[PDB]
Amino acid sequence: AVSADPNVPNVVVTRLTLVCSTAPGPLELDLTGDLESFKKQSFVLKEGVEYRIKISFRVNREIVSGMKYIQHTYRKGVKIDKTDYMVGSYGPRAEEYEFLTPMEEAPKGMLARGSYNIKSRFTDDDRTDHLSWEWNLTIKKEWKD
């Protein structure tokens, strides 16, 4: 046999980047198969840093007009705030795309320092949900020192 039905998906979060003004670098997270490693590691940051998010996703099936990027800030198993970032429509033609969110200040404060489990659900207008994972955000005071 020379094939096993790879089930070519339409739109799925290929990778996740995180740039900033004083960060160590664009943290890249894997969102293809090895996702279990997310709960094993977190993202170190500083008290409420203004960082942007770059989502990447392949589109080789149909045009998904109405893509959305949600994210629930879960704390110790307790959702405290969640929002939906409208990405935009994307038609298949070559490879994935590179979305970009504005600088989002994280939670700051002496107690704000710690790991923050987040719930991101990659879906569209309403047809269905492309993919969703969970990663913790470890806040700090001088991650860039």
From Swiss-Prot:
Record's subunit section: Monomer. Interacts with FER. Interacts with PLXNB3. Forms a heterodimer with RAC1. Interacts with RHOA, the affinity is increased by three orders of magnitude when RHOA is prenylated. Interacts with PSMD10; the interaction increases ARHGDIA association with RHOA, leading to ARHGDIA-mediated inactivation of RHOA and ROCK and prolonged AKT activation. Interacts with KANK2; the interaction is direct and may regulate the interaction of ARHGDIA with RHOA, RAC1 and CDC42. Interacts with RHOC. Interacts with CDC42. Interacts with NGFR (via death domain); NGFR binding decreases the affinity for RHOA.
Tissue: Brain, lung, thymus, spleen, small intestine, and kidney, and weakly in heart and liver.
Compartments reported by the entry: Cytoplasm
Species of the source: Bos taurus
Keyword Acetylation included in the entry's annotation: yes
GO BP term, pick one: Rho protein signal transduction
UniProt name for this protein: Rho GDP-dissociation inhibitor 1
Annotated keywords: Acetylation, Cytoplasm, GTPase activation, Isopeptide bond, Phosphoprotein, Ubl conjugation
Gene Ontology terms: cellular component: cytosol; immunological synapse; membrane
Gene: ARHGDIA
